[PDB]
Amino acid sequence: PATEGTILSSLGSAYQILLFDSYANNNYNSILLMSDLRSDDLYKGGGDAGDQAALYSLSQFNMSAAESLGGLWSIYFTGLARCNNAIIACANAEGVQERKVKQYNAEAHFLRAYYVHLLWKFFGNIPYFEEPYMTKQISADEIYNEIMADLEVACEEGVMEMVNNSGDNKGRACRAAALMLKARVVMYQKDQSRYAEIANDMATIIKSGKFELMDDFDAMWLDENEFCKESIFESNQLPEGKTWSSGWQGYGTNLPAFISPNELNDPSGVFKGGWGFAPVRQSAYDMYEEGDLRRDASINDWRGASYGHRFQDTGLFQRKYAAREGYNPPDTDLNYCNNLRIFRYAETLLNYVELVKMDGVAEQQGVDAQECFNLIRKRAFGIDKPLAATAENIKSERHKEFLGEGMRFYDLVRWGDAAAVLTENDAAHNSVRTYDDNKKLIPIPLNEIEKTKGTEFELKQNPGY
């Protein structure tokens, strides 16, 4: 049997996995960056091609089983096992009020859906288990069904609060987060049977009036705005506890170190130096129209400034999670305080516009898709700038809205635009790669195809690897 304290403890252990992607079993595998490194927005950077070589192969659609993202396999299969114990706990709860038990079971179900959807996005065909090694590998399509079963529990109306941005429950899983995870997963699976349902879910979020767009796109990334009125779910990053030795304790993120210029010298004294990974492409700068405030909010232009130029240098770096003076309280480079904005309301609006205008869903709850799209453009420019909600303009606006937030790659894959948009010979920046359907996945790690070889439960490597 289980008490309230055991359940809160098992759950506490489940949540922790959110803080670890940026040093994942001691691997630099920042979760949104592992997506954007396969977009048309970034290059790999670092000292040279072989400085974090697996990140180069990731960026070039050229990975080998031998150097996959074993660190994300390790932290999310741990995240899965911890969720399983938090759910087993909730099911053997006794003497705990049914209301609270319902909430904790839903938080654990959200977290299990969240961790399994990352394993699903990265690896596809995985050994899945719900009870506390010797497990059948099941197909990406089967895994999808497992995730949607967990989201039915997490999204259930009147169980989790719609938002958890304040009081004792700040940063706890909320119903808006479960519904956004459901939309992300249904849209990535292209499960048309559920488009009307997720469009209605977006409308429910929009109609709740519990969320608004930040007027100041730039400001929303400052620590003052950890849990602002636009944030649906973010990692609670605190600037301490991670060590060069272990990425299995503490609260900090290495991401702002990883992606900021080497030995940067900002005369303004706002920004701080990092390892010079993930430089921004000039094309990503240039796509922004004059007046679009998102450009200078998304991209630090250091083309005039003093820093150590590293591999595939462009002068341009990611701003939202840039290394900032202060955000690093005195193993300081593993411990920035920048919360990862996992879901925000801008995504709620653009998901709704896409499902109505691109996927042909009827408007839900009288929500006007063109008005939602106009809201996005208005915040972008600080003034009304209406634009017809066409597939081309929706795809462009999502591109411009989420630079450095790990959306572009998955959006191109699910749109069927990845082959055309990501296949390139960019010789001048050492980016030469052909996207094909096999590159939707990365390899199952060799060391895990090893630990399983010659058993009933042998792991099969992903196609083309």
Q: Is 456 exposed, middle or buried (0-12, 13-18, 19+ CB in 10 A)?
A: exposed
Q: Is 59 exposed, middle or buried (0-12, 13-18, 19+ CB in 10 A)?
A: buried
Answer yes or no: is 84 within a domain.
Answer: no
Query: Resolution of this entry in Å?
Result: 1.8
- Domain contains 224: no
**Residue numbers preceding breaks in the chain (C to N > 2.5 A):** 132, 330
Whether residue 297 is contained in a domain is answered as: yes
Round to whole Å and give the CA distance between 131 and 185: 23
Asked if residue 321 belongs to a domain, the reply is yes
Solving technique: X-ray
In a domain, 131, yes or no: no
Q: How far apart are CA 128 and CA 91, in angstroms?
A: 20
**3-state SS of the chain?**
CECHHHHHHHHHHHHHHHHCHHHCCCCCCCHHHHHHCCCCCECCECCCCCCCHHHHHHHCCCCCHHHCCHHHHHHHHHHHHHHHHHHHHHHCECCCCHHHHHHHHHHHHHHHHHHHHHHHHHCCCEECCCCCCCCCEECHHHHHHHHHHHHHHHHCCCCCCCCCCCHHHCCCCCHHHHHHHHHHHHHHHCCHHHHHHHHHHHHHHHHHCCCCCCCCCCHHHCHHHCCCCCEEEECCCCCCCCECCECCCCCCECHHHHHCCEEEECCCCCECCCCCECCECHHHHHCCCCCCCHHHHHEEECCCCEEECCCCCCCEEECCCCCECCCCCCCHHHCECCCCEEEEHHHHHHHHHHHHHCCCCCCCCCCCHHHHHHHHHHHHHCCCCCCCCCHHHHHHHHHHHCCCCCCHHHHHHHHCCHHHHHCEEEHHHCEEECCCHHHHCCCCCHHHHHCCCCCCCCCCCCCCC
Domain containing residue 300: 255-334
Domain count within the chain: 1
241 in a domain, yes or no?
no
In a domain, 4, yes or no: no
Please check whether residue 405 lies inside any domain of the structure. no
